[PDB]
Amino acid sequence: QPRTVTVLGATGSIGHSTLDLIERNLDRYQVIALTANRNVKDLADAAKRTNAKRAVIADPSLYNDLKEALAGSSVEAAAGADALVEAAMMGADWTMAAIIGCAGLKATLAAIRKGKTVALANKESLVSAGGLMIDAVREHGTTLLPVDSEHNAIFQCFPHHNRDYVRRIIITASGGPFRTTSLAEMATVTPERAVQHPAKISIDSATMMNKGLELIEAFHLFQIPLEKFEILVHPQSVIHSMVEYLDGSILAQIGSPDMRTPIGHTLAWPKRMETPAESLDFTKLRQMDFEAPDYERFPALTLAMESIKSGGARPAVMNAANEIAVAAFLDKKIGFLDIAKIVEKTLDHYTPATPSSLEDVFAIDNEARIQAAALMESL
């Protein structure tokens, strides 16, 4: 009766919101494995609270701490990169892939190959290994469920088994901190101001690279022609995305910013479940605004568009190059508007062959990073 559950990256924000829903219904779920990287405390605590079968700490050096933290406990202990992959293969009917970056690609792909249900929080997967990821889903009949806000909104409004019914998919975007800033002023932006907030996430938001990546991710998740995707600027961020059908009918997913709504969706799918998420009060909201994205002020959107259009290792290169360029800006080595410049340069000087395995992906990423760092230190 209990549905077995595993969470890769159980100690981050997603991992937390996830366990929050699992522990509220501990009677419906049987936790198999929980993972963390260096936060042995939360990991062992979470493991013990849910009476998980295994707890894995990524960092091999923290192996003895986990083992000691779980002393007298029935939870098994493990550490290292391989242990993550092994935990992803333990057989959980529902797996939350919350380990981000190249570090979670192996585990995520392993979980997918198991053919059960995989809630994807690791969006980066699709940008660098989208093609492979989708092949494995097709091959193993895996149920892939997007956890991220935009893709989850789209999924809830999407006609699965009938892509042909979609006229367009609108990915709403807040616009970022510089939604009303001129290119001229953006040139003088400092890492301090750019990150000001409610690290890299902040900067991808400011350059709108996060929307370029989300578009790429959506492209692989929904298998729809690129010309059917649109980015719509909507400051309030209350509408999380929309899908227009052939009869002109447009379905939209709206709600508060509580991550437990989408996570709750992916956790209960195909059924729905209660989550303490707040009920959007349209009266206090009063207003909703919409405008077109400025492709001239945010060229990253263009770089993203072309990469997918071109295909192959393009998006991988772009994303890798962005990592370098953003870190440079933060390290005050470059100017804000240079980030998109470096990414564009790299995309033009490095165009490897499409990946066939994760090993190729890891390679391209590493190469792109080296190429980018080079160009980055030219001007």
Added chain:
Amino acid sequence: QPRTVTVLGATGSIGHSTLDLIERNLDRYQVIALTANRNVKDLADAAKRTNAKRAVIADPSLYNDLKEALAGSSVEAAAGADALVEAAMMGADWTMAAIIGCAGLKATLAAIRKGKTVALANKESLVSAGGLMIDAVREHGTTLLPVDSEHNAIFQCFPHHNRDYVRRIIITASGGPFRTTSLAEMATVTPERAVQGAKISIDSATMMNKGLELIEAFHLFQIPLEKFEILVHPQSVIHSMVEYLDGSILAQIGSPDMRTPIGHTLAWPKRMETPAESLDFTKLRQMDFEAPDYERFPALTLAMESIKSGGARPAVMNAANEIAVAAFLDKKIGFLDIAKIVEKTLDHYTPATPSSLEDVFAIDNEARIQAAALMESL
């Protein structure tokens, strides 16, 4: 392959939009029967255009004209109230119930009793005979699909087979022409200032149209009254919403083109192309929301109570309203009187819940005489 189709009230706005989609895909549809009241021209035309099996003119007086208009045609001709009910029994897999008011209750119920698919445009149905209509739906396993904007929007965001997944249903409302007018100024409004003739226009101004929609929604979705909410949204681009237990709210948005919801009901469970326009959010710019003023539009309160009370309540209110409105238009009463009359009648007439359409026709007729009486007291 071609799906048999029948349209009751094929000559109105709804029927027109419906035939528009049918004729654009005439290859997948085989029209069985088309119906009209007195517009023999459009009816014969539509009948001939779609190579319909039969054409039915409601007014028995116009029988010869129709028979004339379809001369040399393979379309059979028929007229009279009974002919309508008979046409609704011909067996069409998909039926558009576009006949308005008590005049279409018989045909609509007969179509529903055939157990296939019935696109409901006759909102009336549910207000006056909601209980009966839904019983027949359950008894014959009929697929009932709401055609009006608000209910169709809700249906597309609704978790059928799981009503307990819904936390609330929000019925958006433009707010009507007097959304920003004071009770004081509404008191002196003239019937001319409230048609942009049109009755619907008045129900819009008094917000009775939204009370009625809430009643119809209650019957269509079978969810506790306390779960329905009315939200004023001037732009009217969001047609209605449904909040789920996980906080997630699904909303149906789009252009005002009726072919969208009609296209939805025509293709369900599949989707189909319709010339409907793609809402351009860039040109829309903004969307506004505010709570409905229950004090400035008591009609909303009369509606709530009626459903709350139940039985013949809504039926009486709706009937009472019909008279009160016609009175205002005939300049016999003031604008703010309309809600007064309906209020009075509901209190002086409380028959027993209907058991058949015969009871319904009765209550309506009674409420109408009761209302007309009270109407001419002040």
